Amino acid sequence: KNEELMLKRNYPRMATKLYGNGIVKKQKFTLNNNDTRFNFQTLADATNYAL
Amino acid sequence: KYLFPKINETLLIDIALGNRFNWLAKEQDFIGQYSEEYVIMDTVPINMDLS
DSSP string, A1-51: --TTGGGS------------------------SSSGGGS-SSSHHHHHHH-
Q: What is the resolution of this structure in A?
A: 3.8
Q: Which of B18, A40, A41 lies closest to A49, judged by CA?
A: A40
Contact A25, A35 (CB under 8 A): no
Task: State how far the Cα of A18 lies from the Cα of B10, in Å rounded to an integer.
Answer: 9
Contact A8, A17 (CB under 8 A): no
DSSP, collapsed to helix, strand or coil, labels residue B37 as: coil
